[PDB]
Design a protein. Structure first.
Length: 187
DNA sequence: GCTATAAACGGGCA
DNA sequence: TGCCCCTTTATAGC
């Protein structure tokens, strides 16, 4: 439990990685769809072949421009590992795929701070950043500015941390908010 | 299922 | 440029 990087003693667990990659060749989406079993394609709803693999369980959206977005992994390494497996698939189906400019694009994390949270008290004294309409959505949307991270804060004490590009942004965001959430420990 | 968040992609409207 | 979609993921109330 590394105290320096996380004085709270709680580390958020990563829940979803969104990465993209440039295969750098033009693809026949219809041919890929016919020859692949794990690939769906309806171009009149969405211009991407949706491919899914089980290990690591991820979903790829592959486009005729040769751009691919990989989604569903729970680590950046698993995102790159999955993105490679997709690129080898299209290679074996007869396309000169490359692996150019792989970039994590969005990381989703979550954790628990163990204590219930008085949401109405935080939505008031942090009205500049908070948006809390419980009849619409039971969590309050907290828009942190440095780092530019959105937090979903719930009464139970569970929080969602989104919008980060690097996991250190997720870790830094959680602990800019933890001493805040401590002031609103519900009785 | 709906409601809420972020991101990339291609694509509709303006 | 803006608006709206598009997939995924945690969270949670109806």
């Amino acid at each position: 439990v590394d105290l320096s990087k996380h004085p709270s003693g709680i580390v958020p667990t990563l829940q979803n990685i969104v990465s993209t990659v440039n295969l750098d060749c033009k693809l026949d989406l219809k041919a890929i769809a016919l020859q692949a079993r794990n690939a769906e394609y309806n171009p009149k709803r969405f211009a991407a072949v949706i491919m899914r693999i089980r290990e690591p369980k991820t979903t790829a959206l592959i486009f005729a421009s040769g751009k691919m977005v990989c989604t569903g992994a729970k680590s950046e390494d698993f995102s790159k590992m999955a993105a490679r497996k997709y690129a080898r698939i299209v290679q074996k189906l007869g396309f000169p795929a490359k692996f150019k400019d792989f970039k994590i694009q969005n990381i989703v994390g979550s954790c628990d701070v163990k204590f219930p949270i008085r949401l109405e008290g935080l939505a008031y004294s942090h009205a500049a950043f908070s948006s809390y309409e419980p009849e619409l959505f039971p969590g309050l949307i907290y828009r942190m500015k440095v780092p530019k991270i959105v937090l979903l804060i719930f009464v139970s004490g569970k929080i969602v941390i989104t919008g980060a590009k690097m996991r250190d942004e997720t870790y830094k965001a959680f602990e800019n908010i933890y001493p805040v959430l401590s002031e609103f420990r519900k009785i």
